[PDB]
Amino acid sequence: TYCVAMHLADGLVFASDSRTNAGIDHIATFRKLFTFGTPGERLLVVQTAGNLATSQSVINLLQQRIRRDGASLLNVPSVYDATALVAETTREVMARDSGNLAGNTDLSCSFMVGGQIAGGPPALYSIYPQGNFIQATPDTPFLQLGESKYGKPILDRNLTFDTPLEQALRCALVSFDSTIRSNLSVGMPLDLLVYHRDSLILPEGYRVTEDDAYFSAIRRQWSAGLHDMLERLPSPPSAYN
Amino acid sequence: TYCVAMHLADGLVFASDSRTNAGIDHIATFRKLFTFGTPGERLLVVQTAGNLATSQSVINLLQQRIRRDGASLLNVPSVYDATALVAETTREVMARDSGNLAGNTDLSCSFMVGGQIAGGPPALYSIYPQGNFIQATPDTPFLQLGESKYGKPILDRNLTFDTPLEQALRCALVSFDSTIRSNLSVGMPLDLLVYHRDSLILPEGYRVTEDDAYFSAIRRQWSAGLHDMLERLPSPPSAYN
Amino acid sequence: TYCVAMHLADGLVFASDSRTNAGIDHIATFRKLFTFGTPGERLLVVQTAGNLATSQSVINLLQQRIRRDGASLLNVPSVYDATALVAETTREVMARDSGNLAGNTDLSCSFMVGGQIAGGPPALYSIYPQGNFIQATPDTPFLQLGESKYGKPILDRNLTFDTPLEQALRCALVSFDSTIRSNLSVGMPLDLLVYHRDSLILPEGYRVTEDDAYFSAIRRQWSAGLHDMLERLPSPPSAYN
Amino acid sequence: TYCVAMHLADGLVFASDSRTNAGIDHIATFRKLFTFGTPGERLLVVQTAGNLATSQSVINLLQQRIRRDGASLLNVPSVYDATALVAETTREVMARDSGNLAGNTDLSCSFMVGGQIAGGPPALYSIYPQGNFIQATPDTPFLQLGESKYGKPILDRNLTFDTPLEQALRCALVSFDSTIRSNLSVGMPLDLLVYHRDSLILPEGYRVTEDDAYFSAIRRQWSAGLHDMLERLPSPPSAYN
Secondary structure, eight states: OEEEEEEETTEEEEEEOOEEEOSTTOEEEOOOEEEEEETTTEEEEEEEEEOHHHHHHHHHHHHHHHTSSSSOTTTOSSHHHHHHHHHHHHHHHHHHHOSTTTTTOOOOEEEEEEEEETTSOOEEEEEOTTSOEEEOOSSSOEEEEESOSTTHHHHHHHOOTTOOHHHHHHHHHHHHHHHHHHOTTOOSOEEEEEEETTOOOOOOOEEEOTTOHHHHHHHHHHHHHHHHHHHTSOOOOGGGO | OEEEEEEETTEEEEEEOOEEEOSTTOEEEOOOEEEEEETTTEEEEEEEEEOHHHHHHHHHHHHHHHTSSSSOTTTOSSHHHHHHHHHHHHHHHHHHHOSTTTTTOOOOEEEEEEEEETTSOOEEEEEOTTSOEEEOOSSSOEEEEESOSTTHHHHHHHOOTTOOHHHHHHHHHHHHHHHHHHOTTOOSOEEEEEEETTOOOOOOOEEEOTTOHHHHHHHHHHHHHHHHHHHHSOOOOGGGO | OEEEEEEETTEEEEEEOOEEEOSTTOEEEOOOEEEEEETTTEEEEEEEEEOHHHHHHHHHHHHHHHTSSSSOTTTOSSHHHHHHHHHHHHHHHHHHHOSTTTTTOOOOEEEEEEEEETTSOOEEEEEOTTSOEEEOOSSSOEEEEESOSTTHHHHHHHOOTTOOHHHHHHHHHHHHHHHHHHOTTOOSOEEEEEEETTOOOOOOOEEEOTTOHHHHHHHHHHHHHHHHHHHHSOOOOGGGO | OEEEEEEETTEEEEEEOOEEEOSTTOEEEOOOEEEEEETTTEEEEEEEEEOHHHHHHHHHHHHHHHTSSSSOTTTOSSHHHHHHHHHHHHHHHHHHHOSTTTTTOOOOEEEEEEEEETTSOOEEEEEOTTSOEEEOOSSSOEEEEESOSTTHHHHHHHOOTTOOHHHHHHHHHHHHHHHHHHOTTOOSOEEEEEEETTOOOOOOOEEEOTTOHHHHHHHHHHHHHHHHHHHHSOOOOGGGO
């Protein structure tokens, strides 16, 4: 479980893995990036991390309620209020499943909610286990969920509010490369989605499998590059021994 | 997180850092100085300190509500009432996020609200974690938020109601210099804003980065100065050993 | 005294004369169209007809109270509530000036209140002498105050919800043309204001004087037109004598 | 925080310190003596003690309302009614700030209100935390707020209704001397005001700083005096051991 989302000058970029702890000795693939919207009016993306049961219930309820007269991700007036609604829904799910039977088992999960609603700029939020959330800004334009320390440095080094989408995406992919190599809880397939500021369309998004020609290639290149750079760095002086 | 605001004879000066505790192992840059107003009618500045999620929500709601028929920072009749509105909004945010899920986590934050509305003098208030507030006066013309003990002495020593703006700003910068050296929770970039009494314009404000020529220079000078004065102070008499 | 307001698909159009009965042998010019608002958040227009003293007092109190912590035209959450507030204020003024000293003199006046507040469509109301009101709709998209029968037919004939603003304004002007010719209590200068749906700006509005090139011209063309049509109408048959 | 006020045959004398508890680790200077009036018609003085936020709000509202059609310190018909108005205002402030958010924090404060309105004698009242008040009389011609036990004896010993103003003031200063030495919560600068019975002018008042020549001198003299008297008092008889 590792998710990243970026809010940049030109729009939004989302990327999630799929490897999921579904119980003991049951590791499995589950999508962690979901889209919602009406074309020409709004796009919203929700990413998930943490307890599967909880996050599934949350997503499921959001879907059921879309087709119902009352508060829903399709009528909510701002990306803020969408984020709040997700949080609200999370609280509701935690209330029900909590009891003596759950015991000390940890039901918490976290989300990212981003997108654009007609008539206001695109936005991106991250909801914490405890249900309070923060918004990405130009000074802090990307947010992560899950197992994210491994792939943070490359984003810290290169990403800024002005990074174009194609390059941000690329950057995200390298982030996943390092993460996958160094932590087995993270794993392919990946799910990506790129959204263009003010387009107000629902992009289809894309799934990166094991076999993906492009992702295989940039991994091979990135390795060769790192290995090169390392050999062509100077040796430590006398002093260092 | 360290913010300072001054209300002086000639106007207002505001300065904030940007380093922000956004969770465990996630320290990040977030603007802590926000401006609002209509040119020729009003300027209001809000500074933030404390819990990111809470303060962000508060600022976000104040922005959404500006573009809405009802109480807002643009229609409020006095700087006092602006301060009250911020506080009012804070209460509202605390009410919603509070629950079993937050648990013992500390959601409190503090604010400064200052500026000028057409037809009355400029004013500056500070709102405490508990939602009650105080007003800066000629006898107590500056107020601080956050991690402020480190840089308080220089202000206590030099600042008064009659200090001109350029000098007050300079003074503030030295305050930040000492603070940054002695406490890692405070950090650049800094955000400044100077407002001239009765101008009723929205100044663009200015951001001080790591690279800033002027700020680098006065830090280097101030160090040299202190080091000099210290060596040229006399030795303690016989008595002291 | 003659005022017209229209609520159309593309926005609002307001127009008022200025000739005012201010006592015996004291006929005078007074503005009867007043604007209020905060740019990017709301526009409200109030038009007046009836007793000068009363309407002036009403408008004056609304202005004073704008700059005061409490109910005011700037904080009121809807155009409806604005209208209600105006009415509320009117009642308050009538209560105070009523007494034995006024005697049988007629202190009543009427108002139109229209505009747009952020987050809801534009609206237009008319308040009657007795303080109860009605709202213009697509089927009845214009409302009049004062001496309005003279210029009603041209509006009834041509104006509809879908009439564009430039044409509605033109239509209003022809309404004033006929009125001014046929009733001395109505008189120039006129005051106009056009507001574009969802613009949320405060238009400067425009004053039509005696000298106005455009208004002089359309009056001259309209006359010539009417005179033509009249001569080219057929004669009544034998039967009619 | 220590304030004294005296109502004497020749007029009124007011004196306040300025040291103020404004939060934890934030002790600061705030004026605690405020004047109001119209020359040739009235003088009113308000002194404050207790919670800063509360008292500031009270004073602030009294100022705002002076410039507004309704009950205010400038139109109120007697010093009594002025006192009542201050109390009334205090209640209003306590009502608003009270809630769950304040919690158990202590928002109370106390005031003195004294002065003279044309056509009646000067008067002096003290308002208690609970909003009920008492009036100084010839038999009890001074009243204190704040930390007042330290400097009470010198007033009890020497002050009476017939004490002239210059001597009463002097007496007050000695009161502050002892208080300042024995309690750190009280501190300079001090603010004084002397008002002459029937003068109906607004005296400018005077601020006593750390550096004040006269106050430094009488402190030095008073010390020397006390030390002298003490050494020249007789020894206790045999009996006492």
